[PDB]
Paper text:
RsmE methyltransferases methylate specifically this position in a mechanism that requires an S‐adenosyl‐L‐methionine (AdoMet) molecule as cofactor. The protein comprises an N‐terminal PUA domain and a C‐terminal SPOUT domain.
Comparison with similar structures suggests that Lpg2936 is an RsmE‐like enzyme that can target the equivalent of U1498 in the L. pneumophila ribosomal RNA, thereby potentially enhancing ribosomal activity during infection‐mediated effector production.
Author numbering:
A (entry chain A): 3 to 244
B (entry chain B): 1 to 244
The structure:
Amino acid sequence: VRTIRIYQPGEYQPGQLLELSPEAGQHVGVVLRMEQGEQLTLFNGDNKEFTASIERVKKKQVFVRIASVLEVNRESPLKIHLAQAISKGERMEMVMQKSAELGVACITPLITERCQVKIDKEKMAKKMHQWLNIIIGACEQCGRNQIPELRQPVYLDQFVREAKEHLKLILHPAFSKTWRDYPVQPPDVALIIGPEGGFSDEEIRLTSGHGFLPLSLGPRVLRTETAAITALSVLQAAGGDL
Amino acid sequence: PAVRTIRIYQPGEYQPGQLLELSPEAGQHVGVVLRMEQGEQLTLFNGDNKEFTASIERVKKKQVFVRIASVLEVNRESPLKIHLAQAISKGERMEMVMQKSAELGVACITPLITERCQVKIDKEKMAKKMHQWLNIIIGACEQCGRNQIPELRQPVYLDQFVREAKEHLKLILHPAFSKTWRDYPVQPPDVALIIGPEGGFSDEEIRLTSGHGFLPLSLGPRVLRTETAAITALSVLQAAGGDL
């Protein structure tokens, strides 16, 4: 039967009593209605799985005893840094969930010329929190024991100037280049996915001038969220662990 | 800056200069949902890889009359014909699979009933789901540029599906003795792909699938949601043997 996986950051060790975070204790004690003696698999984000037993439960307050730890790595050797354009109507929540399932290593929300997002500092902080919770849930579900880094949103110019990945790709139709044209292999790859409206000529000159090379994915127009799934699948199959 | 032309599926054969009253469903979509006005352009397509450049000549309530200006043969189908058999699931996961598999160029889709599916659908509810799923596929072809509609097959149980499958390559997403895409001849003409429910397949089902030549495929060490698995598998298969 399926074990219960719970993300719980910290430096706890076998033998210790641990009080779960309010988020973990809400999940375990309130949502799942778990009781004394039941087993959990905690992971702290460092590719470790901790087997733990529930010692005491009071609503969201859950204390557990750490029994043992095992190194368990389900990360791809190809570390993909996805820069995903934020635009109104495009399903960023799906990208966050599925990119985590597909092993993405780092996610940067991206603001480009043709994105339609209206900037609000308070709205963005709430979205960033919701997206991080979605990523965490996806890691609980899919078995990843490291959480992808979710970086603060940046504009395209900052992203391309600062990218240090060894291969740098952008979903774009120029020259009809495919996976056959690239050596996709570890250590890493940066991937820019733009909004439905694409990139301006000036943005294309900027990305090309910083070493981003275009990647097409077939003759059919993919929704922004489908493009993320498809691009990560293709990259992981080509040079990662699919 | 350029706006992409709205695409609308209308069956039939048409000639330049003809006036077409859109079907009531398409007239509702164009006149009411999209609020399009006289003079605006549309690209109709007929499911047989023809695109009809048209303009709105008259909008009378929800009746939309369009003038066909020109016809162009345009095919955006993959040379690898994938037949996806997707196990039925709770919630609205199937609606997502219908939309995205169409975008990924799937040739044929069969809703699959297997032993470990979480759900049961009565016959009248299944008829409604099949109508809704066809409309999602048509909408996805309008969005993605396919001018041919994937075949949506009637739901069947796993034993019927494996008995009838005649595709040259037959794959099932299952971990036991799995191999990756690199170990299979993913190439035209066609491939049958079984995606089961989250709970997997019984030993007897695997005896049935393997006895009919379905070979086990893996897609990495992380457990994918069923809807993610469908779209990941289609992407990998289209890249390996199709037009990605």
